[PDB]
Amino acid sequence: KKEVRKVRIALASPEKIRSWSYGEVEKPETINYRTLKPERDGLFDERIFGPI
Amino acid sequence: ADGGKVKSEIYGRVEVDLVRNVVRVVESYDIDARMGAEAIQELLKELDLEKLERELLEEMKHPSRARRAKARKRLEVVRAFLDSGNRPEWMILEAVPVLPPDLRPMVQVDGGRFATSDLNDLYRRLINRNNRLKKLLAQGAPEIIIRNEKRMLQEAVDAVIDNGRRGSPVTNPGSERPLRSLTDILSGKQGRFRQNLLGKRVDYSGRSVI
Amino acid sequence: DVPSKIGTLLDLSATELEQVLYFNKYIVLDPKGAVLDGVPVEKRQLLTDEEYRELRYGKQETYPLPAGVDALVKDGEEVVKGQELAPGVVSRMDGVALYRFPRRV
Amino acid sequence: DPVRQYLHEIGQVPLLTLEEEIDLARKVEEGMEAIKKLSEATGLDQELIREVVRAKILGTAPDPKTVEEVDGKLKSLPKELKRYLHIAREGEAARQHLIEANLRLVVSIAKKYTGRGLSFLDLIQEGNQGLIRAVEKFEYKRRFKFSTYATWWIRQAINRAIADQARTIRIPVHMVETINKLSRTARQLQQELGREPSYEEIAEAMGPGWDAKRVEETLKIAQEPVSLETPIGDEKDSFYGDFIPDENLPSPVEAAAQSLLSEELEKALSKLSEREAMVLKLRKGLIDGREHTLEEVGAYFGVTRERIRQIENKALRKLKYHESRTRKLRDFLE
Amino acid sequence: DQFRVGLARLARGVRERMVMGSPDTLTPAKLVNSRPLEAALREFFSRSQ
Amino acid sequence: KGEDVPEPSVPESFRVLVKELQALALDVQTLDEKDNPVDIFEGLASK
DNA sequence: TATAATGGGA
């Protein structure tokens, strides 16, 4: 409803960085080599980043 | 030992010898000295910024131009954190953010072959090294090994941030091209700060000879 | 960054900050009254891991012996720098000689 | 240069003599057996004593509670049982020095696996993991040098690492070995033919169970992905991904078409009774996303499978009638 | 000019193939490859401005 | 639908800039007239 | 799971 009139930039604390996060990426995997679906704890996991 | 009949008369580390039936103490302090960003984070956590302000103000009333120029620049940094509310230890990272996936996509193009973003392999190299550090701390590994993973960890984080800045840039196998870091995403001609200024292709447009 | 903000806040040169963050030198948070090379060690002092292990784990020097040769000292006997714990094997430091691997009993 | 830093660090630790190698491996096995006899005397788990001993050795800093209360119970034991505490401590010290003195061997083995997708230091650190597992179940009583057992473990941990981490899209282990077998054969026949093979001849070279279609599909997965940031042309203003269309995001025309379809179907269904429409919406999955069979819909409305089928059929030919007159839904039909 | 460049890269493809193998009897067939010179002329006719 | 085209409440170039800056551990605050936080992500990335 | 193998390479 309100209109953005200024933009501030500052340092991000760990707890603030975790406030942005929908989950911790725990694994280096991306997509399954066969199904091509995202892996469960990897960089494309829908359980944290959102549905495809 | 002996319930109080014998006591050590010097500082040092102990080691109980069962063959000689003796207890030796080597002259060794319990000193606190650290490496890595853990050490810097603690030093940043212990800084009393208000005292450093008074400490530097009284240094720039010194006649020498050189040292009151060093205290002048050093005060600009100190005044910044004070007037902003930024805690100086925040410059050391404990949690590293991860960009949303669709901004660093992975999709198959024509011919079935996949095409992905460099940021993924940078994150992937960071997750690999961070996970190896975890299961090395749990295995109780010696310090030479731990120091190596911590070096490679710092070298993995700042490659995600600004690949190439320090050290040789990380590249994919089969190429010399540096992987695009988060800084290259913002800085430069193709960066996000030049994107809106330089204009765009637009819908609802046409072209013809006149 | 071209003028380091961390190096400025703590009063560390880029060379000093490089050696700490990338595990070349320790830095003293609490000296605990340590001394080295005729001087104490203040807070915020940079020292190599050789100086760190000597100041924290102690100084020990091992001397191998030619085979079959016996030693002139006895087990757990205090030594003096310059003493002859074995013929031709001069003591380089004050301490306590400890036999490590005996071949004859 | 972090490689020169690490090689200098492992350089400070001198190599260990065969006597020291036997003595350290002895204290390790004695310490491990001292831990098991503490799990009988005190009654708690092996790994618990294992970590409490590791703590009190390699570092000072629940730390004040659980760690110190377990060590305190161990300190309050008889003399005959506190021997095994001291034996475990020095046994864990022996494990540390046994590892540190052979980090030099890990480098000598890991350097052969370079250029496979993992850097040198990643090749050293997964190898160091093999060195730890080699020490932990090394038994010196067999009278074999520690270098023989370690070398087998350094190579196991490096090969396993390359199989799990080098690929961007994770590939099973046997397929990686399979892809390596395929990749070695195409280079010697390139030298023999002076040219790259076709899929039939490389399949004839691979042996039985390999045909021209299998080598094409296994080589298909073997290739790493392209970078979207691959530069196009000498101009520094375009990447590969700048020219790739988004095949998954709907266009403005597609997004509107699905909304007009949902709107025009609602207007079509409004020409029916609410039960007629609700039956069709349940049968077609418009409610929850799954086609309900005649049984569930009849259970919803309290009627039979046949009564639902008549409602469904009557509702359809009413829609067909209105559709023959309005023609709103005739398109959307691809 | 770009021909002798692909030969100077075939030169390496000969020099380094000599430290290995059986240095007594090596045919120049398995000492020389078509890949260096082929990729040199193709870069010229397809990429040179 | 014969309607006047609406204005974007928060353009996409704004959204990408913030997330790419948040990726570098920089807190980018979008403030309005009185300096209070505006959430340019409406129930989309707010948790 | 065991001959032994112990400081890189452009």
Swiss-Prot record, chain A:
The protein's name: DNA-directed RNA polymerase subunit beta'
Coiled coil: none
Signal peptide bounds: none
Recorded superkingdom: Bacteria
Family: Belongs to the RNA polymerase beta' chain family.
Subunit structure comment from the entry: The RNAP catalytic core consists of 2 alpha, 1 beta, 1 beta' and 1 omega subunit. When a sigma factor is associated with the core the holoenzyme is formed, which can initiate transcription.
Gene: rpoC
Function summary: DNA-dependent RNA polymerase catalyzes the transcription of DNA into RNA using the four ribonucleoside triphosphates as substrates.
Origin species: Thermus aquaticus
Swiss-Prot record, chain D:
Motif (Interaction with polymerase core subunit RpoC) on chain: 122-125
Segments for region (Sigma-70 factor domain-4): 268-320
Principal subcellular localization: cytoplasm
This protein's record includes keyword Transcription: yes
UniProt GO MF annotations: DNA binding; sigma factor activity
Domain of life: Bacteria
GO cellular component: cytoplasm
Chain spans, region Sigma-70 factor domain-1: 1-35
Region ranges (Sigma-70 factor domain-3): 177-255
Keywords: Cytoplasm, DNA-binding, Sigma factor, Transcription, Transcription regulation
GO BP terms: DNA-templated transcription initiation
Sigma-70 factor domain-2 as annotated region, ranges: 98-168
DNA-binding region(s), chain positions: 294-313
Subcellular location: Cytoplasm
Cytoplasm found in the keyword field: yes
Function: Sigma factors are initiation factors that promote the attachment of RNA polymerase to specific initiation sites and are then released. This sigma factor is the primary sigma factor during exponential growth.
Quaternary context: Interacts transiently with the RNA polymerase catalytic core formed by RpoA, RpoB, RpoC and RpoZ (2 alpha, 1 beta, 1 beta' and 1 omega subunit) to form the RNA polymerase holoenzyme that can initiate transcription.
Domain characteristics, as noted in the entry: Contains 4 domains, connected by flexible linkers. In the active conformation, the domains are in an extended conformation, each making extensive interactions with the RNA polymerase catalytic core. In the autoinhibited state, sigma-70 factor domain-1 packs closely together with sigma-70 factor domains-2 and -4, contrary to the extended conformation that is seen when the protein is part of the RNA polymerase holoenzyme.
Family: Belongs to the sigma-70 factor family. RpoD/SigA subfamily.
Protein name according to UniProt: RNA polymerase sigma factor SigA
Taxon lineage: Bacteria, Thermotogati, Deinococcota, Deinococci, Thermales
Annotated gene: sigA
From Swiss-Prot, chain F:
Domain of life where this protein originates: Bacteria
Known role: DNA-dependent RNA polymerase catalyzes the transcription of DNA into RNA using the four ribonucleoside triphosphates as substrates.
Protein family per UniProt: Belongs to the RNA polymerase beta chain family.
Subunit comment: The RNAP catalytic core consists of 2 alpha, 1 beta, 1 beta' and 1 omega subunit. When a sigma factor is associated with the core the holoenzyme is formed, which can initiate transcription.
Descriptive protein name: DNA-directed RNA polymerase subunit beta
